[PDB]
Symmetry: C2
Subunit: 376 residues, 2 copies
């Protein structure tokens, strides 16, 4: 049992200004940004800080959502050409994950994706050498927790795979609630429910400790109390949920995740995106609560509920109040059916299955997917 944190976290409204203090005169900085963070003026704000710092900088913008290995490879020549000492990742989990993947392939150019990505928990991946490029993560959602995690989630053939290394942990995270105050309702809802998924999975993980549990319970408490207020546009709730998103990231960095993310990774072919975690969570909770009820009971008591059954009800009621669609509403029975057997096999191979409080069969995973689809 281990607990660490590689990331120095700076927080508060206006904390984006810290960039001035983190970068030195003549430091070679490459800024990666989403279309959102460009349009909304946050990229300009970072450039003006780098200008005041007298840094040597360049900006790559309009990084895509749900990044592929092809997305990464297309950016890599620009990276090598500029020869940065420092990355700033301004945007969502998508932008922070693109930057982590570029950090690997820039700092360790002997390593290709196919050598380090965990395609199957039954096949060895190469560990990462020391990666010297400084990474400053500035999340715009609340949130993926990528600003502290050891993982980058990259698609190859419409399946999400991970590279996981403590070397990928961002050197610095800046948590400036001014950014997420700009999320559209559905982005605030989806990324806020991912916090709750992260917190519950980290708490019931085989890898859980009291240290990860303290962060996981507080993040979960904040989502259950504050998320509806944040989705309605309460700035105080937007701050609390932004910090809860990172608290859950600290939890799952140490505690790891579980079946929910193994099954959402391998259901990335489904649109809309960023729904499937929220939808699958209760079905995975009900499966795990069969043989491994104990840690769900423990978390429910810590959250001031009587038992695991009441925590499950609170999760289903929050999803209901935030109008999370049924799986059957966002995928046809034929398309779901034709991909089910391979999805279930690929999910079973995902390394997050090793942390799940119960070891699933392929058939157990297939039956969880079916249960979520039927919604009988």
């Amino acid at each position: 049992m281990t607990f660490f944190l590689k990331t120095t976290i700076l927080m508060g409204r206006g904390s984006l200004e810290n960039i001035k203090k983190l970068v030195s005169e003549g430091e070679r900085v490459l800024v990666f940004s989403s279309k959102s963070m460009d349009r909304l003026g946050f990229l300009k704000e970072v450039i003006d800080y780098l200008d005041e710092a007298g840094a040597t900088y360049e900006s790559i913008t309009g990084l895509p959502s749900e990044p592929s290995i092809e997305n990464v490879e297309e950016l890599l020549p620009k990276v090598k050409d500029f020869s940065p000492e420092t990355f700033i990742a301004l945007g969502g989990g998508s932008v922070i994950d693109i930057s982590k993947a570029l950090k690997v392939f820039y700092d360790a150019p002997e390593l290709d994706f196919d050598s380090v990505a965990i395609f199957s928990r039954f096949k060895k991946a190469q560990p990462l050498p020391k990666l010297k490029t400084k990474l400053i993560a500035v999340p715009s959602t609340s949130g993926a927790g990528s600003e502290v995690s050891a993982a980058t989630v990259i698609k190859k053939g419409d399946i999400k795979y991970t590279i996981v290394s403590p070397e990928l942990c961002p050197n610095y995270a800046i948590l400036d609630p001014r950014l997420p105050e700009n999320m559209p309702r559905e982005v605030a809802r989806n990324s806020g429910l991912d916090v709750l998924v992260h917190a519950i999975e980290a708490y019931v993980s085989k890898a859980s400790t009291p240290f990860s549990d303290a962060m996981a319970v507080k993040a979960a408490r904040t989502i259950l109390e504050k998320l509806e207020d944040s989705v309605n546009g309460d700035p105080t709730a937007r701050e609390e949920v932004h910090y809860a998103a990172t608290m859950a990231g600290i939890a799952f960095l140490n505690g790891r995740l579980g079946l929910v993310h193994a099954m959402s990774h391998k259901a990335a072919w489904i649109g809309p995106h960023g729904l499937i975690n929220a939808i699958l969570l209760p079905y995975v909770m009900e499966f795990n609560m069969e043989k491994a009820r104990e840690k769900y009971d423990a978390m429910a008591k810590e959250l001031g509920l009587s038992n695991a059954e009441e925590l499950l009800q609170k999760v289903k009621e929050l999803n209901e109040r935030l109008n999370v669609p049924k799986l059957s509403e966002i995928v046809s029975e034929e398309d779901f059916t034709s991909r089910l057997d391979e999805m279930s096999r690929k999910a079973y191979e995902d390394p997050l299955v090793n942390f799940n409080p119960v070891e699933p069969s392929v058939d157990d995973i297939k039956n969880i997917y079916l249960r979520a689809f039927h919604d009988w």
Copy 2:
């Protein structure tokens, strides 16, 4: 507003065996331990792991509690003689604090104590350069939180001063509850109440964040619920309180401490040791609550109490039930009244005052000490 943790925390019963993982063949390792960690056979367990790792090692034992700069200077030549790459600090806050002070003076031999210790918050101390000696902190009490903190607490002339630098944060902390299970009742009480002092001062600190607050509340909740069970020999509660001490450590690494530790640093000339933080806490809370109730109320409600007034009552009741002495049991009215003025002046200059929710005068600190003596 910042949150970090430089230390990798390894935990569980038998986690002491991780030493065999963290040390490579031919690594030069210097082990510091207390007499109790030698006598109870934890030093032999560590040497046995270093032997299995094929390390080049040496052991220094019989390290004093409440260490001085003279203590540290007397050991420095033995450190230089052996030329270690790695320290293992096996014992209480005292042993980890000695190990931290030696890491400064070994790694930066151009810096003396008088250049890096914060004698006064009104005068610059030198910042520390990169210190490359790896430090593995194995706390035996529950506890100082020194195994994750950026601080070492060293006496000069019977007053506690600090060196504070992220460079002093141990590389690794091993939390193995077999060690603190051996604490006699009084040591379990004193170090446990220190956790609660740490947790409350970190929460109400001017440098509090939601991250440090989460660690501080869970640490405080564990002490209020479990410390009596632990004092009474409950192995579950010993484990819980051991991890609570490090949580309060994470909390104060970030949040810092306040007027309780400023006042206990400058009252270091009182024996016994370890009581003064627990004695002073309620009086400092009452002082701070007059002007800055807000964070005490927030902490009370997090702990599922109705208000700041009830948290204060719960602290006072715990001290009562675990038989914390009054200040006038452990110091003559002669002694006290004679040093009160200079102690108050020197507590006022302690950098930890900068983090207290309320800026005290010297006279305020004088009157807190007076209310403690006169209860």
